[PDB]
C-alpha cells in the first residue's frame, strides 16, 4: 500500500544467520536481528557493501537480547538495539517490542510488517551429560528451545492480528516460521558430548510439527529444517564412519541453509 | 554380604507409577518414590496390603519434590519424606540426599543400593501453542525433561561411585539401569493439537536418552527409553499402566 515484508533472524551463531540475512537482503527483504550479545549481532548483520547496494526502502536493525535468561527477557521494558544505514555508521536505538522496528520504519505510503521468523537455535554443547551442570542445561534449553517457542508464539499472534488489521495483505508469500534443527536431532547420528543439544533440537523439531497441525486452519506456515553439521568445531572415528551413512544430508554450510530457507519461503 | 537393589520412581501420574511400583515390589525390589505432592505419592505408593505380603527386608519410602521448581530442588539441605512399615502407620523422615534412604536401611550384613531409576515425566498439556503461557512451558519442560535429566545424571554418578565402593556388585544379576518414559506423541503421525510442548518434552527425553546410551557404552550403565501409546487417560497406539510396568520389568530383567 505499499507493504514491505521483514524477517526476524534469531539466535544465529556460525555465519548461518549472516548467510540467511544476505539471502533475504538480496531478495529485497528487511531484517531484525536478535542476538545474545553485541558481538554475535555484529557477526550476523550484513556489511555496508551489501547495505549501500540495497533498494531504497530496505532496512536492517539488530537487538541484543539474552535468551539464556528466558523467561525474564519477555518482561523487559524496552530493548536496546542498533539501526543500520546505507551511508553513515550504525546508531543505537530503543524498542518497545521486537516488532517495533516495523512501526518506526513505516510511513503513510509504506508499511513494514513481519512475514518471516527464522529461529536458528545455535547454542552448542561439548560435554558428557554426567559432567554437565544445571546451569549449562538451562542455557542450552533456553537458547535452543524455550526462547524459540516464545518468539514463535509471539510472532504467530502478531501475524494473525496483522492479517485482520491490514486486509490487503492477503495479496502479498504466506506468513512463515522456520525453525532450525540438526541432523543430530534423530537417527543414527549420536555424538557423545552432544546430549542436551540433541535433545533441544529434537524438541524444536517435534514442537514445530504439532504446531503446524494447529496452524492448518490458519494462514500460517510452520517449517522445520534439519541440516547436517556445518564446518568447524563440533570428531570421534565411529562418527566419521557414521557420517558417511549418507550425503548430502550429513554435512551443510551457511549458504546452503540460507538457500534452503529461501526455497521454503518462496514456495507457492 | 547381601546386596539389595532399590528402585527410584519419579514423576508418576495416572497410575503408571502405581503400576510400576506394583511390579517392582512383587519381584522383590525396594522403592524410593519421588512425588510432586503428598497426594501424588499416596496414589503411587503400594497399599499397606501389598506391603505385609512382601519379604522381611523390603522397604518403601516417599519424598516430596516439586520438579516445577527445577533447578532449585537440587540445592535443598535435606528432603522430607515418609517411611512405610508393614505393621504400622508411616513415619515422617528427613533425608540428606535422594539416595540417603539406602544408607538408613542398611546394616552390617545388608546393603541397600540404587540399581534402577524410572523417570515417568508426567505433566500433560491441554492448550494450543499460541494460548499457552511461558509459565506453563517452564513447568512442562521442568517436570518432563529438565528434572529427569538431573535425576539421570545424579543417579549415574551414584551408580559409578558405588560399583567402585562395592566391587562385589559387578557379580549382581542386573546391571545399573535407567529408563525414561516417553510417549508415542514424541514422533511420527500422532500429532495431537494441544500437545506441542508436551510432545516436544518427550522427544527431548527420548533423544537425550539415546545419546546418553552412546556415552554409557564403555560403562556398565544401561539407558532405556520407552514410548507408550496414549494411556487409558484421555480422548500399539494405546497403553494401560499395567502393561508399561511389564515392559519396564522385561527391560530390566533380561
Amino acid at each position: 500500500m505499499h507493504y514491505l515484508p521483514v524477517a526476524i533472524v534469531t539466535g544465529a551463531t556460525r555465519g548461518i544467520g549472516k548467510a540467511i540475512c544476505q539471502k533475504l537482503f538480496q531478495k529485497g527483504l528487511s531484517c531484525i536481528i536478535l542476538g545474545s550479545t553485541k558481538e554475535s549481532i555484529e557477526r550476523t548483520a550484513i556489511d555496508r557493501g551489501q547495505l549501500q547496494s540495497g533498494l531504497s526502502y530496505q532496512r536492517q536493525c539488530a537487538i541484543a537480547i539474552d535468551f539464556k535468561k528466558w523467561p525474564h527477557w519477555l518482561d523487559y521494558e524496552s530493548y536496546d538495539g542498533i539501526e543500520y544505514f546505507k551511508d553513515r555508521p550504525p546508531l543505537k536505538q530503543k524498542y518497545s517490542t521486537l516488532f517495533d522496528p516495523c512501526n518506526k520504519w513505516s510511513n503513510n505510503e509504506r508499511r513494514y510488517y513481519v512475514n518471516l521468523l527464522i529461529n536458528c537455535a545455535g547454542l552448542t554443547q561439548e560435554s558428557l551429560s554426567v559432567r554437565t551442570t544445571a546451569s549449562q542445561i538451562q542455557d542450552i534449553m533456553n537458547v535452543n528451545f524455550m526462547s524459540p517457542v516464545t518468539m514463535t508464539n509471539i510472532c504467530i499472534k502478531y501475524m494473525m492480528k496483522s492479517q485482520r488489521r491490514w486486509p490487503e495483505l492477503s495479496g502479498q508469500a504466506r506468513p512463515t516460521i522456520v525453525n532450525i534443527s540438526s541432523i543430530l536431532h534423530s537417527g543414527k547420528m549420536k555424538v557423545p558430548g552432544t546430549s542436551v543439544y540433541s535433545a533441544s533440537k529434537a524438541a524444536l523439531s517435534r514442537f514445530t510439527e504439532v504446531l503446524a497441525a494447529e496452524m492448518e486452519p490458519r494462514n500460517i506456515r510452520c517449517f522445520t529444517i534439519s541440516p547436517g553439521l556445518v564446518k568447524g568445531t563440533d570428531p570421534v572415528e565411529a562418527k566419521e564412519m557414521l557420517e558417511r551413512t549418507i550425503g548430502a544430508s550429513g554435512t551443510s554450510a551457511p549458504a546452503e541453509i540460507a538457500e534452503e530457507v529461501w526455497s521454503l519461503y518462496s514456495r507457492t
Side-chain angles (χ1 to χ4, degrees), chain A residues 1-17 19-25 27-37 41 44-46 49-51 53-68 70-76 78-85 87-92 95-108 110-125 127-160 162 164-167 169-173 175-187 189-215 217-229 232 235 238 246-251 253-266:
Chain A
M1 143 239 87
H2 333 260
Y3 296 99
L4 300 172
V6 357
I8 297 173
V9 181
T10 263
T13 231
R14 281 150 285 151
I16 295 172
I20 291 175
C21 284
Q22 291 183 352
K23 244 294 163 163
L24 310 166
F25 219 81
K27 293 286 160 152
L29 282 242
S30 293
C31 317
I32 300 169
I33 301 161
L34 307 187
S36 284
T37 62
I41 277 169
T44 299
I46 84 200
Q50 196 184 343
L51 249 34
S53 82
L55 279 62
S56 193
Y57 59 74
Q58 272 182 282
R59 303 293 178 262
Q60 177 191 257
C61 78
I63 296 169
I65 165 171
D66 213 337
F67 297 111
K68 276 172 180 179
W70 183 95
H72 306 305
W73 68 255
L74 278 63
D75 290 317
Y76 294 162
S78 77
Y79 301 97
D80 292 18
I82 169 191
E83 191 66 48
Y84 291 88
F85 300 89
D87 52 342
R88 34 150 125 354
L91 249 28
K92 300 175 200 217
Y95 306 92
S96 333
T97 63
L98 316 160
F99 300 96
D100 202 38
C102 292
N103 297 314
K104 266 136 162 269
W105 288 326
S106 294
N107 73 24
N108 81 116
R110 72 204 172 188
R111 187 68 222 181
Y112 300 76
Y113 72 107
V114 175
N115 207 42
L116 184 58
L117 175 57
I118 326 288
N119 292 316
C120 298
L123 185 53
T124 67
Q125 178 199 12
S127 50
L128 292 325
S129 159
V130 101
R131 271 167 209 86
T132 22
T133 69
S135 147
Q136 286 157 351
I137 289 161
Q138 215 179 28
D139 294 350
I140 292 147
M141 298 305 293
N142 281 347
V143 176
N144 289 4
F145 184 69
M146 249 64 68
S147 291
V149 167
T150 287
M151 315 250 54
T152 293
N153 285 148
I154 278 182
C155 191
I156 282 176
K157 283 159 58 198
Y158 163 95
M159 279 171 171
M160 271 168 162
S162 304
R164 180 171 80 166
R165 173 175 213 234
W166 304 93
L169 255 186
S170 284
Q172 154 223 256
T176 304
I177 285 162
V178 345
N179 282 324
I180 304 171
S181 212
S182 199
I183 190 166
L184 265 42
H185 85 93
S186 68
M189 269 301 98
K190 307 165 189 177
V191 180
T194 262
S195 205
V196 169
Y197 170 94
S198 298
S200 62
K201 294 290 197 168
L204 192 62
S205 282
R206 185 54 166 178
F207 167 76
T208 309
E209 335 217 79
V210 176
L211 177 72
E214 299 186 348
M215 295 313 292
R218 308 291 168 256
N219 186 21
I220 301 166
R221 308 187 293 182
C222 304
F223 300 113
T224 177
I225 260 163
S226 176
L229 307 60
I246 257 202
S249 70
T251 52
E256 209 195 311
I257 292 155
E259 222 69 62
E260 176 164 353
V261 167
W262 183 252
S263 174
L264 253 40
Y265 184 64
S266 289

CSV table of all heavy atoms in Angstrom, one decimal, chain A residues 181-192 194 198-199 201-202 205 226-227 229 239 242-243 245-246 249-250, unseen atoms left out:
chain,number,residue,atom,x,y,z
A,181,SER,N,16.7,-27.0,13.1
A,181,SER,CA,17.1,-28.3,13.8
A,181,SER,C,18.5,-28.7,13.4
A,181,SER,O,19.3,-28.0,12.8
A,181,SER,CB,16.1,-29.3,13.6
A,181,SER,OG,16.2,-30.1,14.7
A,182,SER,N,18.8,-29.9,13.8
A,182,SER,CA,20.0,-30.6,13.4
A,182,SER,C,19.8,-32.0,13.0
A,182,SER,O,18.9,-32.7,13.5
A,182,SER,CB,21.0,-30.5,14.5
A,182,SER,OG,22.3,-30.7,14.0
A,183,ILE,N,20.6,-32.5,12.1
A,183,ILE,CA,20.6,-34.0,11.8
A,183,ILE,C,20.8,-34.8,13.1
A,183,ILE,O,20.2,-35.9,13.2
A,183,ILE,CB,21.7,-34.3,10.7
A,183,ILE,CG1,21.5,-35.8,10.3
A,183,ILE,CG2,23.1,-34.0,11.3
A,183,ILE,CD1,22.3,-36.1,9.0
A,184,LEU,N,21.5,-34.2,14.0
A,184,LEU,CA,21.7,-34.8,15.3
A,184,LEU,C,20.4,-35.0,16.1
A,184,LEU,O,20.4,-35.7,17.2
A,184,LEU,CB,22.7,-33.9,16.2
A,184,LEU,CG,24.1,-34.3,16.2
A,184,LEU,CD1,24.7,-34.7,14.9
A,184,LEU,CD2,25.0,-33.2,16.8
A,185,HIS,N,19.3,-34.4,15.7
A,185,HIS,CA,18.1,-34.5,16.5
A,185,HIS,C,17.4,-35.8,16.5
A,185,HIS,O,16.6,-36.1,17.3
A,185,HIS,CB,17.1,-33.3,16.1
A,185,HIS,CG,16.2,-33.7,14.9
A,185,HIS,ND1,15.0,-34.2,15.1
A,185,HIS,CD2,16.4,-33.6,13.6
A,185,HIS,CE1,14.4,-34.5,13.9
A,185,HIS,NE2,15.3,-34.1,13.0
A,186,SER,N,17.7,-36.6,15.5
A,186,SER,CA,17.2,-38.0,15.3
A,186,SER,C,18.1,-38.9,14.6
A,186,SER,O,19.2,-38.5,14.1
A,186,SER,CB,15.8,-38.0,14.7
A,186,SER,OG,15.9,-37.6,13.3
A,187,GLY,N,17.8,-40.2,14.5
A,187,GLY,CA,18.5,-41.1,13.7
A,187,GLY,C,19.8,-41.6,14.3
A,187,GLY,O,20.0,-41.5,15.5
A,188,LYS,N,20.7,-42.0,13.4
A,188,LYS,CA,21.9,-42.8,13.8
A,188,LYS,C,23.0,-41.9,14.2
A,188,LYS,O,24.0,-42.3,14.8
A,188,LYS,CB,22.4,-43.6,12.6
A,189,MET,N,22.9,-40.6,13.9
A,189,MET,CA,23.9,-39.6,14.3
A,189,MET,C,23.9,-39.3,15.8
A,189,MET,O,23.1,-38.4,16.2
A,189,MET,CB,23.8,-38.3,13.5
A,189,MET,CG,24.6,-38.2,12.2
A,189,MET,SD,26.3,-38.4,12.5
A,189,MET,CE,26.5,-40.2,12.1
A,190,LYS,N,24.6,-40.0,16.6
A,190,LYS,CA,24.6,-39.8,18.0
A,190,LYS,C,26.1,-39.5,18.5
A,190,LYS,O,26.9,-40.4,18.4
A,190,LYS,CB,24.1,-41.0,18.8
A,190,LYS,CG,22.7,-41.5,18.4
A,190,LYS,CD,22.5,-42.9,18.9
A,190,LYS,CE,21.2,-43.5,18.3
A,190,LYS,NZ,21.1,-44.9,18.9
A,191,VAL,N,26.3,-38.3,19.0
A,191,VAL,CA,27.6,-37.8,19.2
A,191,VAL,C,27.8,-37.5,20.7
A,191,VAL,O,27.2,-36.6,21.2
A,191,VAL,CB,27.8,-36.5,18.3
A,191,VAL,CG1,29.2,-35.9,18.5
A,191,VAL,CG2,27.6,-36.7,16.9
A,192,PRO,N,28.6,-38.4,21.4
A,192,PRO,CA,28.9,-38.1,22.8
A,192,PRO,C,29.3,-36.6,22.9
A,192,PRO,O,29.9,-36.0,22.0
A,192,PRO,CB,30.1,-39.0,23.0
A,192,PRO,CG,29.9,-40.2,22.1
A,192,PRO,CD,29.2,-39.6,20.9
A,194,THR,N,27.0,-34.3,23.2
A,194,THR,CA,26.0,-33.7,22.4
A,194,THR,C,24.6,-34.0,22.9
A,194,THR,O,23.6,-33.9,22.2
A,194,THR,CB,26.3,-34.1,20.9
A,194,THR,OG1,27.1,-33.1,20.3
A,194,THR,CG2,25.0,-34.4,20.1
A,198,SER,N,21.3,-32.2,21.4
A,198,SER,CA,20.5,-33.0,20.5
A,198,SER,C,19.0,-33.0,21.0
A,198,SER,O,18.1,-33.0,20.2
A,198,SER,CB,21.0,-34.4,20.5
A,198,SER,OG,22.3,-34.4,19.9
A,199,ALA,N,18.9,-33.1,22.3
A,199,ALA,CA,17.6,-33.1,22.9
A,199,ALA,C,16.8,-31.8,22.6
A,199,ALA,O,15.6,-31.9,22.2
A,199,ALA,CB,17.7,-33.3,24.4
A,201,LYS,N,17.1,-29.9,20.0
A,201,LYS,CA,16.8,-29.8,18.5
A,201,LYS,C,15.7,-30.8,18.2
A,201,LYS,O,14.9,-30.5,17.3
A,201,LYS,CB,18.0,-30.1,17.7
A,201,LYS,CG,19.2,-29.1,17.9
A,201,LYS,CD,18.7,-27.8,17.2
A,201,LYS,CE,19.9,-26.9,16.9
A,201,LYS,NZ,19.5,-25.8,16.0
A,202,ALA,N,15.6,-31.9,18.9
A,202,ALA,CA,14.5,-32.8,18.8
A,202,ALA,C,13.3,-32.2,19.3
A,202,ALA,O,12.2,-32.3,18.7
A,202,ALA,CB,14.8,-34.2,19.5
A,205,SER,N,12.2,-29.5,16.8
A,205,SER,CA,11.6,-30.2,15.7
A,205,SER,C,10.2,-30.6,16.0
A,205,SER,O,9.2,-30.3,15.3
A,205,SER,CB,12.4,-31.5,15.3
A,205,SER,OG,13.5,-31.2,14.5
A,226,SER,N,16.3,-29.5,8.9
A,226,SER,CA,17.1,-30.3,9.7
A,226,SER,C,18.5,-30.5,9.1
A,226,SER,O,18.8,-31.6,8.6
A,226,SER,CB,16.4,-31.6,10.1
A,226,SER,OG,17.3,-32.5,10.8
A,227,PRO,N,19.4,-29.5,9.1
A,227,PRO,CA,20.6,-29.5,8.3
A,227,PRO,C,21.7,-30.5,8.9
A,227,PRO,O,21.6,-30.8,10.1
A,227,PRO,CB,21.2,-28.1,8.4
A,227,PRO,CG,20.6,-27.6,9.6
A,227,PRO,CD,19.3,-28.2,9.8
A,229,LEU,N,25.9,-31.2,9.8
A,229,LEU,CA,26.8,-30.5,10.5
A,229,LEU,C,27.5,-29.5,9.6
A,229,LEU,O,27.6,-29.7,8.5
A,229,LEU,CB,27.9,-31.4,11.2
A,229,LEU,CG,27.3,-32.5,12.0
A,229,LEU,CD1,26.4,-33.3,11.2
A,229,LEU,CD2,28.3,-33.4,12.6
A,239,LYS,N,31.9,-41.8,14.4
A,239,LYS,CA,31.1,-40.8,13.8
A,239,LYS,C,31.5,-40.5,12.4
A,239,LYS,O,30.7,-40.3,11.5
A,239,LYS,CB,31.2,-39.5,14.6
A,242,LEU,N,30.1,-43.0,10.5
A,242,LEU,CA,28.7,-42.8,10.6
A,242,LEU,C,28.2,-41.8,9.6
A,242,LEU,O,27.2,-42.0,9.0
A,242,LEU,CB,28.2,-42.5,12.0
A,243,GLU,N,29.0,-40.7,9.5
A,243,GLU,CA,28.6,-39.6,8.8
A,243,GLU,C,28.5,-40.0,7.4
A,243,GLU,O,27.6,-39.6,6.7
A,243,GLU,CB,29.7,-38.5,9.0
A,245,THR,N,27.0,-42.3,6.3
A,245,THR,CA,25.8,-43.1,6.2
A,245,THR,C,25.0,-42.5,5.0
A,245,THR,O,24.3,-43.2,4.3
A,245,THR,CB,24.9,-43.0,7.4
A,246,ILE,N,25.2,-41.2,4.8
A,246,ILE,CA,24.6,-40.5,3.6
A,246,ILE,C,25.3,-39.1,3.3
A,246,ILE,O,25.8,-38.5,4.2
A,246,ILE,CB,23.1,-40.4,3.7
A,246,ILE,CG1,22.4,-41.4,2.8
A,246,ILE,CG2,22.7,-38.9,3.3
A,246,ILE,CD1,21.0,-41.0,2.4
A,249,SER,N,23.0,-35.1,3.1
A,249,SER,CA,22.3,-34.8,4.4
A,249,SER,C,23.3,-34.7,5.6
A,249,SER,O,23.0,-34.0,6.6
A,249,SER,CB,21.2,-35.8,4.7
A,249,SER,OG,21.6,-37.1,5.0
A,250,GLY,N,24.4,-35.4,5.6
A,250,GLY,CA,25.3,-35.4,6.7
A,250,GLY,C,26.1,-34.1,7.0
A,250,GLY,O,26.5,-33.9,8.1
